[PDB]
Structure formats: C-alpha cells, structure tokens
Ligand binder design. Structure first.
Ligand SMILES: Cc1cn([C@H]2C[C@H](OP(=O)(O)O)[C@@H](COP(=O)(O)O)O2)c(=O)[nH]c1=O
Ligand SMILES: [Ca+2]
Length: 129
C-alpha cells in the first residue's frame, strides 16, 4: 500500500474526517475501526481525540487498501495518517475504538490493530473498563 497526500477540511467524529483529496472534498471513514457515536459513552472522547490528532498534524496522508475505496455512502475508506502516525491504530490503542468492519481484501492492517486492541484491553482503557 502507499500513502497519498490530503489536507484536513474538518474533523467530523471519532472515525470520519472531511479531507481534500486530489483537490476534491470527500468524507473519509477510517478502515477497520469503530468509534462510538458522539451521543454514546466515549463518543465525545473519540471525536476529540481524532479532531486533535488531525488538526495538529503538519501532514495528513490517506492510504487505501487493496479492495473497495468508497463505501455505499460515498465515503472514502482508508488508513489515515497524521505526521506519520496512523489514526486508526492510535484510536484502537487508546481504547477509543474497537477493531470492526473487517472485510476481506480490505484488511491489510488487521493484525497490527488487533495487537493494539489487546494492549488497550490489557490496560483496561476507556471502552475496556
Ligand atoms: C468501516 C466500513 C463501514 N462500512 C459501512 C458498513 C456499515 O453499514 P450500515 O450503515 O448499513 O450499518 C456502516 C458503518 O459505518 P459507521 O460505523 O460510520 O456507521 O458503514 C463499509 O461498507 N465498509 C467499511 O469498511
Ligand atoms: Ca462509528
């Protein structure tokens, strides 16, 4: 896989961000994770985490997987990186997202994220208490 440039337009919630990609605005949905909705427990803490990560980054990048690039809602599906650090992994590592929506052909970083979830769970973090 490989990283392509994008700029933050707006952080939306824990697992969705509006980015400008190849010069067009697009909502991106973070592969392989599930943050709570904003109205759910740790929903607000998830939104804040992603909003800070992406807004503070000097450099946002998107990395598509080997399968479907847009979901049925026209959202882009990608691994999202902020100054080289994967948002999707960081959310799981802090127990602000569960590993979820693992579809075949779009699951390159599954076990890296599962490894992060296991640590979060061992540490009894946020979602895991
Ligand atoms: C993460 C992800 C979600 N989706 C669709 C499946 C879920 O369908 P349904 O909307 O029919 O429940 C929905 C969950 O997104 P949210 O978790 O953002 O709602 O998004 C994909 O199709 N591919 C994916 O990789
Ligand atoms: Ca969600």
């Amino acid at each position: 896989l490989h990283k392509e440039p994008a700029t933050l337009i707006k952080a939306i919630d824990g697992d969705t961000v509006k980015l400008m990609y190849k010069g067009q605005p697009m909502t991106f949905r973070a592969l392989l994770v599930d943050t709570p909705e904003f109205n759910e427990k740790y929903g607000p803490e998830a939104s804040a985490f992603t909003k800070k990560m992406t807004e503070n980054a000097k450099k946002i990048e998107v990395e598509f997987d080997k399968g479907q690039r847009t979901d049925k809602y026209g959202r882009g599906l990608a691994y999202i990186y902020a100054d080289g650090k994967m948002t999707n992994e960081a959310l799981v590592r802090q127990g602000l997202a569960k590993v979820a929506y693992v579809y075949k052909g779009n699951n390159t970083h599954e076990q890296l994220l599962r490894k992060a979830e296991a640590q979060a769970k061992k540490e009894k973090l946020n979602i895991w208490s």
